[PDB]
Amino acid sequence: FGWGDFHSNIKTVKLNLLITGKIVDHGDGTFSVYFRHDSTGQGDVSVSLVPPTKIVEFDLAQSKSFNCRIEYEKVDKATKNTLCNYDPTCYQEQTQSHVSWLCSKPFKVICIYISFYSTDYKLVQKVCPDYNY
């Protein structure tokens, strides 16, 4: 595949995001991509597999050509709600996700797409580790 053990950290004082990705070749013409991510703070995060043609852009929104699809996803979110004491609502969110992608092997140029929307900054990034292949 030309790469493995993907990791990414996106950090502001309002939100910290930690991602890992792992590839498992099943030896049957398919392979899995597993993502785990954990975030603490305020904001929305997402990680996904996308084709190289995916345009990097900000987006308020949350098959046949692309041969990777989610087969399993598990998300656990814990929210502590308290009164802001700079002004008596402040909250802290702890999120832990696990997603299993299943890809069909006749194609392999795949990219990782990460979005990060906090209360101070927002960021989208596309990583194509073997693009030049």
Binding site: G2, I10, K11, Y117, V124, Q125, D130, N132
Partner: protein, 194 residues
């Protein structure tokens, strides 16, 4: 003091890298910008496999880079705001291929992202192509460049460094170097963009 330049949309610096080609396993680019314009190229280096393109795109900082066998693109922006707010913003981009392991970091003000992955096969960073700051020739085919506008605003302390050399491009422009060429005329200060 600080090395600064004001670009008015028809100017740019061009540092020649042909004679002394840069080659290194890691590099780092830093600069500060101030601008009111939504779109404009801040710097580009690499007319080959490897390259770094740093620009403002619709008020956001856009980074497009080649990373050995891979490519990386990021778009960064404040919430309820844009970076073309006539205030200084600090940018830092680091790339590392040390083990193989690829690692890219970009920070703009108060947001930092570090991304990496194990990559067995491994090349070099740099290029023998020119280094463009504040703009580029109209007929130049610059890979990985999403914008075509030259910069309109202030660039400060533009610096490129790797394991061998540290190029103070803004200062070299302000002072002069045989490898540094300027298209047009710029004042080496930050004029009132407003």
């Amino acid at each position: 003091d600080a090395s600064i330049a004001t670009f008015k949309g028809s100017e740019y610096f061009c540092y020649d890298l042909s004679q002394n080609p840069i080659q290194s396993s890691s590099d780092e680019i830093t600069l500060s910008f101030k601008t009111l314009q939504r779109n404009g190229l801040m710097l580009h280096t690499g007319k080959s496999a490897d390259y770094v393109n740093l620009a403002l795109k619709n008020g956001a900082v856009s980074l497009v880079i080649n990373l050995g066998s891979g490519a990386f693109e990021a778009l960064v922006e404040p919430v309820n705001g844009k970076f073309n707010d006539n205030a200084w913003h600090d940018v830092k981009v680091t790339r590392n291929l040390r083990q193989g392991h690829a690692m890219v970091t970009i920070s703009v003000d108060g947001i930092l992202t570090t991304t990496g992955y194990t990559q067995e096969d491994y090349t070099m960073l740099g290029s023998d192509d020119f280094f463009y700051v504040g703009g580029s020739p109209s007929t130049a085919d610059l890979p990985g460049s999403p914008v075509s506008n030259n910069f309109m605003g202030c660039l400060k302390e533009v610096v490129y460094k790797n394991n061998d050399v540290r190029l103070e491009l803004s200062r070299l422009a302000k002072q002069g170097d045989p490898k540094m060429k300027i298209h047009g005329v710029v004042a080496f200060k930050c004029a009132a963009l407003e």
